[PDB]
Amino acid sequence: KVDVTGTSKGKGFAGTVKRWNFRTQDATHGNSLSHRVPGSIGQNQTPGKVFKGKKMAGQMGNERVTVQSLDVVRVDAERNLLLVKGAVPGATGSDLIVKPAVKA
Amino acid sequence: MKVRASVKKLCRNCKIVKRDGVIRVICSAEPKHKQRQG
Amino acid sequence: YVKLQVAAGMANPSPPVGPALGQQGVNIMEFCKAFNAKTDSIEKGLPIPVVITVYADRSFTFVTKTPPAAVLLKKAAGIKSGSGKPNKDKVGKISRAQLQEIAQTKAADMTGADIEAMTRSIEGTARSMGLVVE
Amino acid sequence: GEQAVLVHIYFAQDKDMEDLQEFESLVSSAGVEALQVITGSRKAPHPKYFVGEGKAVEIAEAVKATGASVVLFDHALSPAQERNLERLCECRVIDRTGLILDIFAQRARTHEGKLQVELAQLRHLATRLVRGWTHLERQKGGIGLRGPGETQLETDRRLLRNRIVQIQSRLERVEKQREQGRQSRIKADVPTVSLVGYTNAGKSTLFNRITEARVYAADQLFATLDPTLRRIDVADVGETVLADTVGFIRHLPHDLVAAFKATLQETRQATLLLHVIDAADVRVQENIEAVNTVLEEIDAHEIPTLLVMNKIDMLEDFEPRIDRDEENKPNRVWLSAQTGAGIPQLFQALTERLSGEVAQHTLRLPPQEGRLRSRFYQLQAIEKEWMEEDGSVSLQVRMPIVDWRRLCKQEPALIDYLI
Amino acid sequence: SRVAKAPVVVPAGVDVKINGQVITIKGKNGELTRTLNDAVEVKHADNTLTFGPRDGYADGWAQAGTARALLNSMVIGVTEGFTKKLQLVGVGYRAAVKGNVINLSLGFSHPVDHQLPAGITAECPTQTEIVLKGADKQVIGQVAADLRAYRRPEPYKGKGVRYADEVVRTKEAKKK
Amino acid sequence: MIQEQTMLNVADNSGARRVMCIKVLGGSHRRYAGVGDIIKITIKEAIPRGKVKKGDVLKAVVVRTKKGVRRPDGSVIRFDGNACVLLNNNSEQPIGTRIFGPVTRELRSEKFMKIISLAPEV
RNA sequence: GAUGUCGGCUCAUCACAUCCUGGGGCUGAAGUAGGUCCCAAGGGUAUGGCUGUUCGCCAUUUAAAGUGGUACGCGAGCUGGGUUUAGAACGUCGUGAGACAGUUCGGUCCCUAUCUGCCGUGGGCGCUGGAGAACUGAGGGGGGCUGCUCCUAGUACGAGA
RNA sequence: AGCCAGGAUGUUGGCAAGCAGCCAUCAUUUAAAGAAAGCGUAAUAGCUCACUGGUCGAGUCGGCCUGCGCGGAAGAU
Ligand SMILES: Nc1nc2c(ncn2[C@@H]2O[C@H](COP(=O)(O)OP(=O)(O)NP(=O)(O)O)[C@@H](O)[C@H]2O)c(=O)[nH]1
Ligand SMILES: [Mg+2]
Ligand SMILES: [Mg+2]
Ligand SMILES: [Zn+2]
């Protein structure tokens, strides 16, 4: 088993529905301009602030991601190849760092 | 055991012992008589 | 080990007697032959419980015991029951002659320095049943 | 415990009639002093007052003349009818169900009884939320304006429902407690018999006589609240649990019956019901009907039952006996409480009632049977005891099959007489 | 207090060294060491030991008594070993010694194995018995307690590991 | 891929013609029942004088779906309709005797052997 | 010289008097299954019918469907079913105008974000001659749920079940 | 406080044996024993407490009045 680290595909500025799996509000039944909006973002004046680390819209992807415990299917010395089960982070032609599995 | 603010000897085999800043009753006959203050 | 009262003279009555002491493992056909011959001289109907020191291989041997005292009181009283609480209702007070006749049952196997001290012992049950002396 | 005018109506057309003597008994048990007892006759209830306008004016005049404090109807009447009677006569009005709830409130001494009675009162009062007289008046407003957001009637309904749910939750806690107390016996092969019936049936004193344990009994209606369980001896199965129970009355309130779900768990799960009946009561058939009706209401009519006619001493020149069905199973028994007649026959019928064994074994061994004494006398008993020749001892025994099996497993079972 | 006053008659053939607070005792069975509390003065004045408090310590007497008991156990252990008995009550419960390792069968789906400490030895005269021998009373007690921890005696049938001296209270099961 | 409110045909002779899934059994918030998954159903159409009747609530097993099953080599078997086989609530054995139409090897488990035995194909 | 009300949606956050999962004492704990108390807040913690509903009843689930705080969290985030306008009608009251903590049908929800906060992303300078890389890691965030089946084993326990 | 020894006679008191409950609740030989403290026994047997002495050589027992401490003591950025 190996762990593969790479830079995931970059999605750019991502809304809360895509970035955090927020549930969209009603598409009909009176909804005014509030279909994919994040909804409420806090309480009323007792905290009086937005808390740090809150799930909102922003940059998604294009970040270091590791995938752990992927099976090694084939190790080919002559052609300098390693076949690993499953998808690994990043686009085709991007740098990957492959380590032995730490958990195994 | 039973945790109650009032701990007493429930029979003649009970013994009061203070262990970790906590008063306890240990009984060598009836395990129901195990008590701690709390 | 269990013990129960035994009828001395009766053989094969259904309610009271069977596991009295023969079920402990004593050969009753010999025990209630020798002891029945002994109690033939004893008055009619005195259940007398002896101490048991026996084996479990068809062999036995019994020690002597004096007959009871509580059973004998109710002869002259004319009543064969008991009161719920003595000292309030009585079954008829009996005489000192009868009390000493009952006492003489326990006189042959007592090691006391003075035999008169047994008077209090015998009259304890007299007071605990309602046979107050005059 | 105040002055009252009593009201009764002869609704002979339908089965919604009630007994005036029983009503007076309930009133006196409550402790109320009756200054007058008014009677009427109608076909169906008047919607406005529950009585005619003329009869309502008569009860108002009676209250005015006698200076009475309350008016006790012998009937269920609606909140609007109560309101209209209150408007005619300033004195307060108590329904039959209100009187019963008040009696139970006075009688309740235990935590469980208090909980059940307050639940019943809370439901009965939640029915009577019709007048919202308050000093805050109607809260005017509009769109986007401050305010409570809801009506006071709805708010009060919310509050009553919430507190009713709270009483209920503590009641299922009490049910869990009583269920643990029950489950102590069910893991054992316990026989459990619950004696139940109409009030003043003598069933509490029957319990007292059978169990030799003191429990309250008198000529007071609804004397007993909550059950009492006691160990009793029966020839066949040995140890059994006799349970006393709170009595019934014609037309128990449904809210009260629902409240007593925790208390009635003994009758729900009883292995036998002893339906104790006052033979001297001229309304004996009505008592049977009412008791069966409440049993159906609590859904406990499928349990085995056995009727027990008490108070035969009030019947002239009668001796106790047992009436038996076509299947030769005792379905009815007669007896008396004080004289003790019929008690041994009740015990014999109880022996016959529950059992699954009639075979009797005969045992004998060499001198290795003190353990047999202990085990037999441990499970049940020695049925027929005697000795025979050569020191052998011939027992005859009859104990349940479960006792047979456990004895066989425990012992070497070399006696080859007991299975 | 009184135990502290009572002195420890140190027998022959055992070597005592009072290295300040550190106290070492050698004997036929082995060497045992202790580091007494700071509020104890341990002294030689004969073929014996003497215990007392150091001035300026409230505990003083308390410590003194504890040191006396510990050193008495030390000398007893080095002279003659401390022994402990354990017994296995069970349908198929068993013990075996493979050399500083005690294999136990106690109804578990796996076999238990207890590796003994350094100075403790084990024997099994019978499959249902374990004999512990050692120098330190505390260590042999702790090892016996660990052996009991796997299956301490349950009340209904007395099933498991019990000290041979213990009275195990047995309660009847639910009625009928 | 079977949800609540979805209509299923019946692939057995228990009597029901169409049933509706009202709970997907398994875990909490579970979404879909695939082939070989137990569902809770209500009968919406039934032949008269059958074992079951209209309005009955009982259990069923999905034996065919339009979404299909995936095989380990990556193939898909899709069907023209969704069909199930009725089961008893407390025993999970099929109510009927005959099974109509094909099934898959996803029912190759110790509990659905009786369905596989009387299925006409696979 | 205005601090928008009930319920719903979106998004949540803490407390622990714990609903589930973990650890344990007692048990009227034989076993399975429970009860009660103590420790424990890491994670998890229903879908529908009816009703404006919160609740509640019911159906079917789940390991569980916790209890409370947060302007009874959350309308410069949505809605507008309910309450609390103007139209109209029924019952009731009043001579009437009208009224009702009765019911019924209908009935406008604005704001382009300066500051705090928060999610992302840059410019400047600094880090002591400049520049290119590769790091250590002080510190911070994420994540931490659980069911069912089989073996041990029809064994331990149990009269059996 | 530690360390050895005895708890028996009527009698299984009576209405189940001291030990379900109820009434007598008194003797006894005697250094001593409550018609019996719970356990336990179907219940006896058994268990042993109260009950009394031996050996053990400096303090020990438990009520009162008070100083200061301990537990009783769980909330929401
Ligand atoms: N003449 C006579 N009176 C009896 C008889 N049995 C009971 N009684 C009397 O009737 C009343 C019975 O009351 P009780 O024992 O409480 O019976 P209950 O039905 O359990 N009371 P409740 O159900 O109301 O709690 C008492 O007055 C008792 O004296 C009987 O056989 N004959
Ligand atoms: Mg839109
Ligand atoms: Mg009663
Ligand atoms: Zn105790």
Automatic annotation (TrEMBL), chain A:
Tell me which residues bind Mg(2+) 2.
Answer: H35
Q: What is the lineage of its organism?
A: Bacteria, Pseudomonadati, Pseudomonadota, Gammaproteobacteria, Enterobacterales
Q: Where does this protein come from, organism-wise?
A: Escherichia coli
Q: Which domain of life is it from?
A: Bacteria
Give the family from UniProt.
Belongs to the universal ribosomal protein uL3 family.
Biological role: One of the primary rRNA binding proteins, it binds directly near the 3'-end of the 23S rRNA, where it nucleates assembly of the 50S subunit.
Name used for this protein in its record? Large ribosomal subunit protein uL3
Positions carrying N5-methylglutamine are Q45
Reproduce the UniProt comment on modification after translation. Answer: Methylated by PrmB.
Q: How does it assemble?
A: Part of the 50S ribosomal subunit. Forms a cluster with proteins L14 and L19.
Name the positions where Mg(2+) 1 binds.
Answer: G10
Annotated gene: rplC
Automatic annotation (TrEMBL), chain E:
Against InterPro entries, the record matches this protein to: Ribosomal_uL6-like, Ribosomal_uL6-like_a/b-dom_sf, Ribosomal_uL6_a/b-dom, Ribosomal_uL6_bac-type, Ribosomal_uL6_CS
SUPFAM superfamilies associated with the record: Ribosomal protein L6
In the UniProt record, does the keyword Ribonucleoprotein occur?
A: yes
Query: What UniProt keywords apply to this chain's record, in alphabetical order?
Result: Acetylation, Ribonucleoprotein, Ribosomal protein, RNA-binding, rRNA-binding
Q: Which GO BP terms sit in this record?
A: cytoplasmic translation
Q: At the top level of its lineage, which domain of life is listed?
A: Bacteria
Q: What is this protein's function per UniProt?
A: This protein binds to the 23S rRNA, and is important in its secondary structure. It is located near the subunit interface in the base of the L7/L12 stalk, and near the tRNA binding site of the peptidyltransferase center.
Q: How does it assemble?
A: Part of the 50S ribosomal subunit.
Can you say what this protein is called? Answer: Large ribosomal subunit protein uL6
Protein's organism: Escherichia coli
From TrEMBL, chain F:
Name the SMART domains for this protein.
Ribosomal_L14
Q: Which GO terms describe its molecular function?
A: large ribosomal subunit rRNA binding; structural constituent of ribosome
Q: Name one GO biological process term.
A: translation
Q: Which terms are listed as keywords in the entry?
A: Ribonucleoprotein, Ribosomal protein, RNA-binding, rRNA-binding
Tagged with keyword rRNA-binding: yes
GO CC, one annotated term:
cytosolic large ribosomal subunit
CDD domains the UniProt entry points to: Ribosomal_uL14 (cd00337)
Q: Which InterPro entries match?
A: Ribosomal_uL14 (IPR000218), Ribosomal_uL14_bac-type (IPR005745), Ribosomal_uL14_CS (IPR019972), Ribosomal_uL14_sf (IPR036853)
Q: Name one Pfam family in it.
A: Ribosomal_L14
Keyword Transcription appears in the UniProt entry:
no
Classification via PROSITE patterns: RIBOSOMAL_L14 (PS00049)
- Give the domain of life: Bacteria
Biological function: Binds to 23S rRNA. Forms part of two intersubunit bridges in the 70S ribosome.
Q: Which family does it belong to?
A: Belongs to the universal ribosomal protein uL14 family.
Subunit field text: Part of the 50S ribosomal subunit. Forms a cluster with proteins L3 and L19. In the 70S ribosome, L14 and L19 interact and together make contacts with the 16S rRNA in bridges B5 and B8.
Query: What PANTHER family is this protein classified in?
Result: 50S/60S RIBOSOMAL PROTEIN L14/L23, LARGE RIBOSOMAL SUBUNIT PROTEIN UL14M
Q: What is this protein called?
A: Large ribosomal subunit protein uL14
Species in which this protein is naturally found: Escherichia coli
